[PDB]
Design an enzyme around this catalytic site. Structure first.
Site, PDB file in Angstrom:
ATOM      1  CG  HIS A  55      -0.575   0.154   2.524  1.00 34.36           C
ATOM      2  ND1 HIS A  55      -0.085   1.354   3.014  1.00 34.36           N
ATOM      3  CD2 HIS A  55      -0.641  -0.735   3.543  1.00 34.36           C
ATOM      4  CE1 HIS A  55       0.182   1.140   4.294  1.00 34.36           C
ATOM      5  NE2 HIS A  55      -0.137  -0.104   4.659  1.00 34.36           N
ATOM      6  N   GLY A  84       2.526   5.883  10.751  1.00 32.93           N
ATOM      7  CA  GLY A  84       3.953   5.735  10.487  1.00 32.93           C
ATOM      8  C   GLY A  84       4.488   4.351  10.838  1.00 32.93           C
ATOM      9  CB  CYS A 140       2.356   0.679   7.656  1.00 32.73           C
ATOM     10  SG  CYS A 140       0.653   1.162   8.066  1.00 32.73           S
TER      11      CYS A 140
END
Ligand SMILES: O=C(Cc1cccc(Cl)c1)Nc1cncc2ccccc12
Ligand SMILES: [Cl-]
Lengths: 305, 296
Positions: B41, B134, B136
């Site tokens: 993503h 932040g 991920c």
């Protein structure tokens, strides 16, 4: 979102752990620059532990009696000295993995990470707090002496604790990195017991503010209290007195959530009186006291839910 | 003595964390050999990927910029081929875990590790983690001897505050998808074999008030476990608890009768290992490891 008991990443400390052997005793040491720091009781026998004269035991030792192992490499001891209850072993090699560091002495209520070690090998990392009775509720087995407590705010490792012993109740006692014990404890096998412990009030308040930030307000009420009336109540539940310093320290969390410190104090008073009534706060059925105001600000979001 | 929620030492994983930037998005990547793994993503993901070139992905390892020389997708994970192999690459494996298993999470922001905590894969396939924007790309792992077994990569937070992610081959745990759509965690259950393991840890540490003279059949215990939203206990769970049963002298079904009474009557103002709730995030192996001192 979420709130966990979080420890600092342990890598900077792992690269400092060594094994220290003297006679029959094996424990852990902290290798920084060309010095290995470890508990002085490594020179004792179990008999010696009743009334050890460390100065008399140390004068009989030479450098080659201390065996230091860093991984699979044997380090050479070229000097030795005692500073309070810590032994400092001068070695022939500086640790290339030495991080930026400081030795700090902490106060009761302060939290830190512990890297539990056995035979100079790290086994686990957990978070804990210096209790008001100066003990720590750790998880340590035989061979864990010399394991260290630390904080890593920014990229500097602040060493605050070295493990020395377990008390009869299963709690642990130790020193700062200059060898001064926390609490009225001695590195002697003598009748020693932890004093009656209390709850860290400023930390429970910080944790109640963390719950409000994470979107929960069920415990709040319409009341307020004076600092004096709160302390008269809190001391009946074995809670530490709340000082004006604690109130000032909770200022930022108060401004972020919109809840005055003495209003959060009124909510705590009611929780102590009523219990949780089948409810939880941040996944806990007890009032948590091992998160400082600084820990809450570091872990939680700057935006209240 | 003592019983803490303990994580594995994180050093071997810290030396693998990098920052990955693509356009406006900044998240974390896992640098192993000459490949950086991160959530896809960060960029119809095949149509989105074909439009990107190597130089669009900015990878930073500390203060050093890594050059991306190739890119490919495997399920929900993006694999960025880089010009430099990580000299700090540990011995590692990619493993997929089952619900009930535990692991350590090294939470990161901007490729910099901030904290380490222990957690479990819930029966509903979510994790009750602690993550902000932040985070991920932060990874979950176990250490067995000197080998790091990577089992989780963080992808998203669900509306209830719980987390969802994938194994290191990009397959999600649970019926989740990597997109902003109506997704919710299913009804969760308690990990029964883990509560039993934690009751054995309490007995080993001197907490015996909940022990009783009674026993139960596996079938009668499971009829009671279904009523309190507890996962069924299988004969495999009973066999796995064998060593702890032999050490304490309390048969698994004998401990099940203690757990049945705790569910029907409560704790009555008492605690077990400093907790007023029945703890389910310690596996039988975690209990044996923490009550033996295994090192890495
Ligand atoms: O207490 C000691 C050794 C000691 C004895 C007397 C005085 C001093 Cl200064 C040190 N070791 C241990 C430290 N932590 C945890 C332990 C758990 C079980 C057994 C020993 C454990
Ligand atoms: Cl302090």
């Amino acid at each position: 979102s979420g709130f966990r008991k979080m420890a600092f990443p342990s890598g900077k400390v792992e690269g400092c752990m060594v094994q220290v052997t003297c006679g029959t005793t094996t424990l852990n040491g902290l290798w920084l620059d060309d010095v290995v720091y470890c508990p002085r009781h490594v020179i004792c026998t179990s008999e010696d532990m009743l009334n050890p004269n460390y100065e008399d035991l140390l004068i009989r030792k030479s450098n080659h009696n201390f065996l230091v192992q860093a991984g699979n490499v044997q380090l050479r001891v070229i000097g030795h000295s005692m500073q309070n209850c810590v032994l400092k072993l001068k070695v022939d090699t500086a640790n290339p993995k030495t991080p930026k560091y400081k030795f700090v002495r902490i106060q009761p209520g302060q939290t830190f990470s512990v890297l539990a070690c056995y035979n100079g090998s790290p086994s686990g990392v957990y978070q804990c707090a210096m209790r008001p009775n100066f003990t720590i509720k750790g998880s340590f087995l035989n061979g864990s002496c010399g394991s260290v407590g630390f904080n890593i705010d920014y990229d500097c490792v602040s060493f605050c604790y070295m493990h020395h012993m377990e008390l009869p109740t299963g709690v642990h006692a130790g020193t700062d990195l200059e060898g001064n014990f926390y609490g009225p404890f001695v590195d002697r096998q003598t009748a020693q017991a932890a004093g009656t412990d209390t709850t860290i009030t400023v930390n429970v308040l910080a944790w109640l503010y963390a719950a409000v930030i994470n979107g929960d307000r069920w415990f709040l009420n319409r009341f307020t209290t004076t600092l004096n009336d709160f302390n008269l109540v809190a001391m009946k539940y074995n809670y530490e007195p709340l000082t004006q310093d604690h109130v000032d320290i909770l200022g930022p969390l108060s401004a972020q959530t919109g809840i005055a410190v003495l209003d959060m104090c009124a909510s705590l008073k009611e929780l102590l009186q009523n219990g949780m009534n089948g409810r939880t706060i941040l996944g806990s059925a007890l009032l948590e006291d091992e998160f400082t105001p600084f820990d809450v600000v570091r872990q939680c979001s700057g935006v209240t839910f």
